[PDB]
Amino acid sequence: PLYGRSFADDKMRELFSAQSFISRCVETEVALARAQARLGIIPEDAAAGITAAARTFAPEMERLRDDTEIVGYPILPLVEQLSAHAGEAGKYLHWGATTQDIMDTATVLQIRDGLALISRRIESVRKALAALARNHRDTPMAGRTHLQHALPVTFGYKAAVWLSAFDRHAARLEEISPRVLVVEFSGASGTLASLGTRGLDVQRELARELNLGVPSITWHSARDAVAETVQFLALVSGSLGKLAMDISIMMTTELGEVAEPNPVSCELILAGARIVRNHATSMLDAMIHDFERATGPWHLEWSAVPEGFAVASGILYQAEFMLGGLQVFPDRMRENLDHSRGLIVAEAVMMALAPHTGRKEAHDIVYLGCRRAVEDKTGLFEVLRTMPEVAKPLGEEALRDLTDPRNYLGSAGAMVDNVLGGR
Amino acid sequence: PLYGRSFADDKMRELFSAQSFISRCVETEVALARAQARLGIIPEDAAAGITAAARTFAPEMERLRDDTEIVGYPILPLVEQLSAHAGEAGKYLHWGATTQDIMDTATVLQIRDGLALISRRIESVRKALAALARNHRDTPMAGRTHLQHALPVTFGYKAAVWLSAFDRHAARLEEISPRVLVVEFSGASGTLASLGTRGLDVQRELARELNLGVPSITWHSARDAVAETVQFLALVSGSLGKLAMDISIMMTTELGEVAEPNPVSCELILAGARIVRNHATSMLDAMIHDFERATGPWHLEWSAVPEGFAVASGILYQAEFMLGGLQVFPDRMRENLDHSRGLIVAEAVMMALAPHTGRKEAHDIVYLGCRRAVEDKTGLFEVLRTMPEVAKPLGEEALRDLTDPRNYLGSAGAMVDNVLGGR
Amino acid sequence: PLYGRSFADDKMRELFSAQSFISRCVETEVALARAQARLGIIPEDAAAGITAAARTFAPEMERLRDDTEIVGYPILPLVEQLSAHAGEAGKYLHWGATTQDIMDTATVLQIRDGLALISRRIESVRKALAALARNHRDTPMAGRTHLQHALPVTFGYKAAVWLSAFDRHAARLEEISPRVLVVEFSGASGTLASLGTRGLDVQRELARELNLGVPSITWHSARDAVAETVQFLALVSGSLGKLAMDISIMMTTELGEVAEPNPVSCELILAGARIVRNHATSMLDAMIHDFERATGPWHLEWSAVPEGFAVASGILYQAEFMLGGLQVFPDRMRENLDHSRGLIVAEAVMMALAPHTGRKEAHDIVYLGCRRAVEDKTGLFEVLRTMPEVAKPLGEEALRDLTDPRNYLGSAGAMVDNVLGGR
Amino acid sequence: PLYGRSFADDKMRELFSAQSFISRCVETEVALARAQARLGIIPEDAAAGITAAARTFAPEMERLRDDTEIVGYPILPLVEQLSAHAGEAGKYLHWGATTQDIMDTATVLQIRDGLALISRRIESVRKALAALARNHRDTPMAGRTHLQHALPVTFGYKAAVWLSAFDRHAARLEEISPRVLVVEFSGASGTLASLGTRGLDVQRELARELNLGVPSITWHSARDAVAETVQFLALVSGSLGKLAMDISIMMTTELGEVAEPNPVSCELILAGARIVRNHATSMLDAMIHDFERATGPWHLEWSAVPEGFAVASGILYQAEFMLGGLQVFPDRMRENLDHSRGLIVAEAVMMALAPHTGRKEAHDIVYLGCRRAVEDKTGLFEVLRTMPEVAKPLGEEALRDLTDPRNYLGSAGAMVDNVLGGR
Question: Which of B280, B267, B258, B262 is nearest to B315 (CA)?
């Protein structure tokens, strides 16, 4: 279809393409042969022969697609093509393997590449956020609670908040990786029966050959490490959605506080976040995976994994681009901050007044000053100055200072420094 | 409503009750007063007075409920009741705090208790699974792929697979806890402006008083650590759903391989898993939390957190009970394993035959033997014995051995030992 | 829990309470007895006795709750209490019935009341929208596409759009009602075997007694009419969410175009819409209802129906209230419309210019006029007037008229009249 | 990607392809020109010229794709290509139109074709179900409640239940069609300002030209008729999931009651049902469509509509195929029905006994007979015959009859006839 711009990443689509999947499938079968020759399970020349045939092997992709439709899966047709190519040594291919072993393991190999690309995009996101946080550390603007002026903040403060989430997501990525990056090799019902007593030796050797962890046990039907990976994609997408909401709303005509380098990046991010969320939902369904293999639940991973990855990668890329070139308008920010003519810093007059009148009293006086500033379509300073119960204890100069929003930024700057932590 | 049995945990409901929430709210305000007196921000006798008034303070809950409906939130009415009770020292309560600070922080205190109860139930689940895995390590049964006989497995093998997931969930719980268990104290728009330059000192002192971490920055609108907690609840629930599917299907009249101590625990687990999944979905939506506070998204946490916790706790409790007293029937298991009369171990004859005939040939001979056993409504041994291309190379005694499913369990036992790891 | 305001309707909660459910359960059993006495299936005095005992019968609710936990369901304990109360005639109660018959049918009776209350709230919503549409038919304001000024619209036009959706939802409600409002009476596995050949006679008589339709066949496991009802709740909630988005954004400080009578109604509506959506999701899951009864899927209806109803009713009530008393500010609307100083009606100059210069040419001239108005921080009229390729063909008076947004409202008024259709 | 078989329909993919979308886009623009020439809004030769250029027009698809990435949408680039081709008459193209008008309307044209294909597949589904219901009307089998033997049913009875849902879905399709099949033509902010006073005339003429209804008002941001269409797809998918659950479980080795013509159709249906459910979820999100156009929410339709259609069509096709050639095994059905050796018809002995002993007494006697049949691993008849409190009042011949499950099918046959209703 042709509608608009895609939120899916082409690099992440190349990664989960048929050609790439198949080549990881071959990679797995060759490593299995090698693992078995080292453990003396198949002849050493059979593995040598298999290794060499694979160096020169080029699958016949259309034949593969056609046979998959007949057989249900590409693995045994792929083994047939590889066997034909290898001659006599090919008779030792896929020895003790089942289809889900090769498909799970090839999937894990792609997930390794998928996660390196995700990590790379999360690191660019953090970099562009740290720059915004640093450069706009002292750029004042209105803080908003339910879309309405609350107290002054700075734009670097906002960027630091966005950044803090991505610092946490970077940490999550590193925790999830050793759980999901494990080999699958357990055979038709997960017992490796066809290998007699040597099954666990093969499984461990195979992990080593591919540079993967070893699972505690068969995970044909224990899908939690894969589900948590897509859940993680969905969590990152949610954090992208938050900043996309903020930016697209700051692009409102009457605000005009920023501009993207239609907020098209925000559009793609916000739609994509919901689609990734849906892929996480499917993975929670796919976990209800009955007995030793269930084709229904398993089929659900086949969209949720590659598409969760493609879409999450594309919206991270949209965020890298948007945040990297974000146009920030301190002039519009300053103008919007003055919109309430000091009302936004009523709290600062209360704080200053309380030691003189007491706390409830200070609150009552200033809220009265605020109702009148509003009702009289004038500034808070111009109301408060005529009110001797405030003006006399504070003085007019102090009132001018306290009603200037630029003077009430609190720990904003220090909070930014804390998150940046010497970046 | 009155329908059937509840999948929600009453202990987890007491934990998120109004009374408990309110008492954590008071706990937070008192700790805030104490933190401020140590940093010289409020008078030491004001904090002493607040601490003592709180020891004797008992909220007026109906008054609180009524005022919340007027004000929108219980915090300021609760502060009013506590102020009245404390006399003069009460004027220093909620100093520099906003409502979401107290509500977020009190929520975090409940989550600490919620997570200890979740951890406790996950540990009982693992214990009952390890017992099943150990005692039934060698109990043979049919492995099933798409609900059909695949190869022999043991029931302890199945339990070890279920167990392996829960071993991983235990690890996840420990990783998530330091992220979610952090104080919230940042004031009305997250800058602590009302505290001048001392805001971060207060925030850190307050974390110490309550024994919580310190956030990198304000998380009024960065909700990822809370979202990941409910996502985690949903992942555990998914693993409960998998074993509930397996058990309820093994209770099928024609199977009869186990019994619960209607599979009512399986019913509750399986419905509950979908409801927890829905609470995780809501949390991903709640993450799109615009600016410095957005009431819509925030309102979504108010069901998703307490109810995600209550339901996940209740279905973990149902699993503790069911798995702790699971009735396992090795007799029905043995009978179902013999259903195919050796067909389930055709692969074992192939494995044995291959060295004599070659691999494709062995496969073709035995699949032919299998088609005839089926078409002739007899056992595989009785077909193969009359087939000299198998009988002569193997011998009839070997054929009897190879067609007995009890002889083809592979690494099942060793895989169980691996997961148990000296439990 | 105590957090804020509830989005759930108390009337709709009373409707789905245990007491109400139970009383519909009794209503169903009595009607079943009556249906059977008319068809000569049970003695006429047995039905008379049952009818009279039920007039005076008051369930023992705590005993019921306790027994449900033992039995799994309230129906047979409720039949026991009713039997005891009726004396000898009680021995003919629940004759040929199963538990799901009584529970499905009692649920349908509540759904009838639930749908009348939903219809009532949808009619108040439409009324308050028609008033807004009518009174503000000619109130000009900026149209917004991706939150940015597009062309002029009127606020009545916006209200008419919101209204049009609710006109369609009213129609949907009437279509769904005869599908969902049917009796369930089919016995333990849906064949009414215990009634010999008279089962369908009883089922039809029973529908008549309760004033319900007759299903085509047993729907113990065909749940589509119930699922479509909650889906419908979710669709209405979505339309409430749209207008809640619009209103809460129009309450933005810099907009200030309306006010609710924190946009608390918008908060509740927007959170509630997602929760109703989640209840619809659960109903789609509950539809996968295996064989003749499956307790897992069925358990899912037990939250999704009563809670979908309660929440959808509460957010409709919030919308009735908010829209009924909506404060509309034509002054802020007029001010925001002038924000772009005629840029918002560049299209009107193009339209007028095209006959003179051609179409692409008119577009190029005016877009150039627009770039300069922006770059020169002045109004579009003040730029265009100095541009003889526009000023000379059009004349300055015409330019003044064309750059006034109030002159470019198109069919807004007529579109409003169309939707109102003589209301 | 290459994994297994697709659940998406290629015909439905051709329908939502770029080429097809674009050709409907041209169809819309030509009809708009024609509508305008009839109302005297553009010259008659301009429309004639546009009509003729379109007969010969062939878009340059790669150029279109490239320009969409620059412009955001294919509409204005497509208008440019069509203008170039038409010469002078092309200057009247897209007169008063906005991009979403053409894209919404072209989408509606595809939905018309999509719904005809859905209707066609629902009619084949109903046909294959009616055949199964009719041919197996009297084929006895065990009814199952929570996967366990309940009472006898027939397989035609099961098929009639499945059928009844699809009869209702056929009715729903006809109700939804006039709501969703309406033109979109309202211009940039939905007021048709650029057409002065003639906008509604054009909109109505255009509906007539394309053979669509006329909307009550602009639906750029009122998306309920589109959302309800995908919700409907999700409801049908749910009903497919129910029968797919039933069939795949009846393929369990120990059951063996049916076979598909791996239950691969059941796999695809069951995964697809969850994916369609997810597309319905996205549509409920897309409904929160702020102001006069919001690109984020709108972008969500761009996957949910074409993919909801493609997947729902593919799983309907899988069901047509599977149900059309379903292998039904009355022999395995009869064998499983005898599994309980009369226990499954204990209720029939109770029914017969009650007039002699009373009702509670009859229940107690037979449940005792049932406990002993179980504990003694013998048939119910062989226990009951030795029990004079049953044997003497009933007689042994009657006991033999009552313990034969084939004698207890109730209204099964009549219920089948009711649903078939003379098919």
Answer: B267
A156 vs A128: CA distance, rounded Å: 12
- Sign of torsion over alpha carbons D110, D113, D116, D118: negative
Domain ranges of chain A: 1-97, 98-338, 340-423
Residue A353 tokens, joined: 């007044």
Longest dimension (CA), chain B: 103
What would the two tokens of residue C379 be?
């109004």
Do residue A2 and residue D74 have CB atoms under 8 angstroms apart? yes
Q: How far apart are CA C75 and CA D75, in angstroms?
A: 61
Structurally, at CATH architecture level, domain B340-423 sits in: Orthogonal Bundle (1.10)
For domain B1-97, the question of CATH label 1.10.275.10 is answered with yes
Cα-based distances in Å from C83 to A294, C25, C62, C259: 48, 14, 18, 58
| Cα angle B418, B419, B421; round to 5 | 65
Which residues, including other chains, have CB under 8 Å from residue A350's CB and lie 6 or more apart?
A362, A363, A366
Which DSSP helix (H) or strand (E) runs through D259?
strand D258-259
Judge contact between C136 and C156, C-beta under 8 A. Answer: yes
Asked if B270 has any chain A CB less than 8 Å from its own CB, the reply is yes
DSSP C291-342: TTB-HHHHHHHHHHHHHHHHHHHHHHHHHHHHHHS-EE-HHHHHHHHTTTTT
DSSP letter for each residue of D356-395: HH-HHHHHHHHHHHHHHHHHTTS-HHHHHTT-HHHHHHH-
The pair of three-digit structure tokens given for residue C200, joined into one six-digit string: 């369908």
DSSP structure class, residue B328: E
Q: How far apart are CA A100 and CA A72, in angstroms?
A: 12
CA gap A283, A308 in Å, rounded: 10
**C-alpha distances in angstroms, B213 versus B180, B183, B205, D28?**
9, 6, 10, 61
- Asked whether the beta carbons of residue B4 and residue C73 sit closer than 8 angstroms, the reply is yes
B183 reaches C (C-beta below 8 A): no
The subunits that touch chain B, with at least 3 C-beta pairs less than 8 Å apart, are A, C, D
Residues of B in contact with A281 (CB under 8 A): 277, 281
Helix%, strand%, coil% for chain A, nearest 5: 70, 5, 25
Question: What gap in Å lies between CA B7 and CA B14, rounded to an integer?
Answer: 15
Question: How far is Cα B95 from Cα B71, in angstroms, rounded to an integer?
Answer: 19
- Is the CB of A149 less than 8 angstroms away from the CB of C253? yes
**Domain D98-338 class, CATH top level:** mainly alpha
Residue D350 has phi, psi (to 5 degrees) of -50, -55
First to last CA, chain C: 43
> Is C331 part of the contact surface with chain A (CB cutoff 8 Å)?
no
Cβ-defined contact of C216 to D295 (cutoff 8 Å):
no
Question: What is the torsional sign of CA A21, A26, A27, A32?
Answer: positive
Round to whole Å and give the CA distance between C74 and C22.
8
Question: Do the Cβ atoms of A143 and B227 come within 8 Å?
Answer: no
The rounded Cα B295 to chain-centroid distance in angstroms is 28
Q: Treating both helix axes as pointing N-terminal to C-terminal, what angle do B75-86 and B18-38 enclose, rounded to 10 degrees?
A: 60
Burial of B113 per CB tally in 10 Å (0-12, 13-18, 19+): middle
Closest CA to A253 of D399, D236, D35, C335: C335
Q: Say how far apart CA A295 and CA A286 lie, in whole Å.
A: 10
Listing DSSP states for D82-142 in one string gives HHHHHGGGGGGSSSS--HHHHHHHHHHHHHHHHHHHHHHHHHHHHHHHHHHHHHTTT-EEE
Share of chain C residues as helix, strand and coil, in percent rounded to the nearest 5: 70, 5, 25
Measured between alpha carbons, how far is D55 from C109 in angstroms, rounded to an integer?
A: 59
Q: Which technique was the structure solved with, according to the deposited record? A: X-ray
- The answer to whether D337 faces chain B, any CB pair under 8 Å, is no
